[PDB]
Amino acid sequence: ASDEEFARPTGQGAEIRDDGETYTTVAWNATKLTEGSRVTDEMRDQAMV
């Protein structure tokens, strides 16, 4: 939503001017973060961990 404002001082009998709430957005574009690893089956066997 747009910011708050102040009411206008107005003459007697004079009509009300409009200043409505305006709107906008912020978009999200979720970016795929990725991470990877490869181990040989010989290493996977022989490691103590």
Binding site: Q12, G13, A14, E15, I16
Partner: protein, 82 residues
């Protein structure tokens, strides 16, 4: 000693309030000489009242010569957009 008309007592007098309110609802302009007795101007200190015709209902009421639609007698400061 203070009398009702004395300058320090005027704000205590109910009539000074009531009659200044009357004066504001009577007027069409700030020209007091055009509208009020010189007694009233002094007695009710009408120079100091914000008399300008903005408080008179007749300033805002419609009163056209011919009325086919019942528009007359509406007060503009009572419309939807006021």
């Amino acid at each position: 000693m203070q009398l009702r008309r004395s300058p320090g007592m005027r704000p205590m007098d109910r009539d000074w309030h009531q009659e200044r309110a009357r004066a504001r609802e009577q007027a069409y302009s700030s020209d007091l000489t055009s509208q009020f007795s010189e007694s009233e101007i002094v007695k009710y200190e009408l120079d100091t009242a914000q008399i300008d015709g903005s408080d008179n209902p007749r300033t805002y009421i419609w009163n056209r010569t011919i009325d086919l639609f019942g528009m007359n007698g509406t007060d503009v400061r009572e419309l939807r957009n006021r």
